[PDB]
Amino acid sequence: SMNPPPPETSNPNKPKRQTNQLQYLLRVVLKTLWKHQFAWPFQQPVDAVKLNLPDYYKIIKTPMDMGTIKKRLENNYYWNAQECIQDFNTMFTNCYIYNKPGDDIVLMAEALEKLFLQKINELPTEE
Numbered sequence: 001s002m003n004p005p006p007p008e009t010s011n012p013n014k015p016k017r018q019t020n021q022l023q024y025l026l027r028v029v030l031k032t033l034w035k036h037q038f039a040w041p042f043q044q045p046v047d048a049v050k051l052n053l054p055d056y057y058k059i060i061k062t063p064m065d066m067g068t069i070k071k072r073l074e075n076n077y078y079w080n081a082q083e084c085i086q087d088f089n090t091m092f093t094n095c096y097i098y099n100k101p102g103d104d105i106v107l108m109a110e111a112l113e114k115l116f117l118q119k120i121n122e123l124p125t126e127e
C-alpha cells in the first residue's frame with residue numbers, strides 16, 4: 001500500500017545524447033500529449049496512497065508516467081529515442097494491465113496512445 005521511490009530521472013554516469021529524434025520526442029510528442037484534456041492522471045507517478053490503490057505497486061513493477069518522461073527529456077537522461085518510446089509504452093501498458101477495459105482511465109490512456117502513435121509514425125530520420 002505505500003508508494004515506491006519514483007523512477008530515476010538523473011544519473012550522472014549514464015551516457016547521454018540530445019538527438020533530433022529525442023528533440024522531436026520532447027517538442028512534438030510529450031508536448032502534444034501533455035496539453036491534452038486527458039493528460040492530468042498521467043502527469044506524475046501514480047500515488048497509490050491518495051488514490052487508495054494499495055495493490056497498484058504489487059501489480060505494476062515498472063512504473064512510468066509523463067512527469068517522469070518530461071524530467072528525463074528536459075534533463076537529457078536518454079541515449080536514444082527508443083528508450084523514451086519504451087517509457088511511453090510502459091506507461092500505457094501499465095494502465096491497461098492494472099485496469100479493466102472501458103474504465104475511464106483506460107479510455108484516457110487510449111486517446112493519448114492514439115496521438116502518440118500518430119506522432120511516432122512521423123519520427124524524423126536521425127540526422
Ligand SMILES: Cc1cc(-c2ccccc2)n2nc(N)nc2n1
Pocket residue numbers: 040041042046051053095098099105
Ligand atoms: C496512470 C493512472 C492514473 C490514475 C489516476 C486515476 C484518477 C485520478 C488520478 C490518477 N489511475 N487510476 C487507476 N485505477 N489506474 C491509474 N493509472
